[PDB]
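Predicting holo structure, zinc ion bound.
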Amino acid sequence: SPELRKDPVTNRWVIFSPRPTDFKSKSPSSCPFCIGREQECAPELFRVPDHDPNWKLRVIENLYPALSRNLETQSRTIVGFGFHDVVIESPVHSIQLSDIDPVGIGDILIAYKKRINQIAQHDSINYIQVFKNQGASAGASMSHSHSQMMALPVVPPTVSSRLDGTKDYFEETGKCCLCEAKSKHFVIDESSHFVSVAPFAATYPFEIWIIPKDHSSHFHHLDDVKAVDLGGLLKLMLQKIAKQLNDPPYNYMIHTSPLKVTESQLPYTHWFLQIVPQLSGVGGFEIGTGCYINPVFPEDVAKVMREVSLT
Amino acid sequence: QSPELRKDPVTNRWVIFSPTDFKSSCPFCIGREQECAPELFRVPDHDPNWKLRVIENLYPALSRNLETQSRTIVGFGFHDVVIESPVHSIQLSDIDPVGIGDILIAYKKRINQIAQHDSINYIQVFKNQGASAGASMSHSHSQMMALPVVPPTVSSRLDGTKDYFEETGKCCLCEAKSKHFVIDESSHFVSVAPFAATYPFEIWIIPKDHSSHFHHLDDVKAVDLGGLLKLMLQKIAKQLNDPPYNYMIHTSPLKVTESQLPYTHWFLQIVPQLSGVGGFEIGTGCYINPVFPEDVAKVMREVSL
Ligand SMILES: [Zn+2]
Ligand SMILES: [Zn+2]
Ligand SMILES: [Zn+2]
Ligand SMILES: [Zn+2]
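Done. Tokens:
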């Protein structure tokens, strides 16, 4: 049954028009990121344990940054200023994040936080995007496990689009769209402080939003318990995806608040984590319209992910 | 070199600039029609010996039956496939400009038919060739998708240009030669590199005059464009080693009110399917471009065919 849907968090029409059971992936031994080879990496910001030779993760600068941290005093057209950094996820070469315990993932998530705060000290930076790219066509240039963060001198579309949307939904309904998640999105799994769902008007097939059950406008408010919990759920979400979809290239994106949000935006600004398994590409309709075509309804995705067995 | 952000009213979004080096029978075969979804018309009109046909898409993304019905809406819309040549062995651009004229004019004929439906908000026409750019069939061809609402790209375009117009009192597209990097122009267009293009080697073909409506396309301009579109697609393949592509005609919704006409202008966007996308762009909606439009224009101004 083809229809069009819209989520006040993404604010753009997606078409739903397809079987959910047949969707599957179709997309060295050492590296400079490996422990004992830090001399081959760009400058470090910090490493957990705090300044320790037997480290768990490190937060280093990107050797080929997309934005220049040396254009700060210099800010139609603006200068390429930013902080494009890399968070090293494991000292080990070949272990994928989803195979990292949930407590270790919690710590990686705690690093993002600490860095965002370190960055939030720069009045120029207005929004950092914490995102992970695992896989060639999902953009993984390194095989070792890592995630990327970039701090921007502007507020992007989806954000002002998400902020422009959840506010319009709040003004009327009185509620923050994500607080209504279990009643407005399809439930997959739930942890102590988070719940996962196939979004009502999902962009991509098999897309996931791990959503804080409590109302929290900014990611950086991650504590140790929540960081370990969410880790377990993120670990659970990445394993059900890998089994059910045959280890597809996938990336994840943390969505949070503009650095200088308003006291008013808080009641409807609610962060979350989006997981997008790569299962297909686009054509001239999408690039041209900004509207996506999703071949699987979240009604089915939610049934599948619930039926996935992990033993 | 030094990265830089840049915006444009047409896109109304900043892109991250971060820097001639780039590069790379069927059912549609004349004699198998009954094997295609229904026909809306062909050209020559009602000619068994056709040069192009506009048919319904066998696997439509939006159902043309759900018309009666209609944060959510029914999947009503039309989806058609323009078959650009009864010869399985031809590149859209290896085609004669006059014949490209035929196809364009056909888009116009199908839009007017569609415009008769009060339920259609926008009418995007696009071209897919090459696997990586999205294509599933090799025979040369393009498509049309008619929608019940105005999509994301048009939304912003209306906002970006409107706001720009409240500024300098000028339609930015009419100012193409003072805002974009000109590579080439014919008696009616200026294919251009856009000041703040989203994709590397992106090319915009811009009607010189202010035609807030693609469907205002006439015969001489129709073939006037064909020659320039052809020239850009051939220069594209030449310098970039024949990369798949998806060009997109940008134009105006069927409910364009009068207050939006001075600043709404239609243009064609060529995207050699190159650059890849990962989490940054997915989470932000802000693309990164490795090559500035100043370098792309010079490179393409020197292409020899
Ligand atoms: Zn390695
Ligand atoms: Zn909330
Ligand atoms: Zn053919
Ligand atoms: Zn104009």
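Residues 1-30+156-311 of chain A form a domain with the HIT family, subunit A fold (CATH 3.30.428.10).
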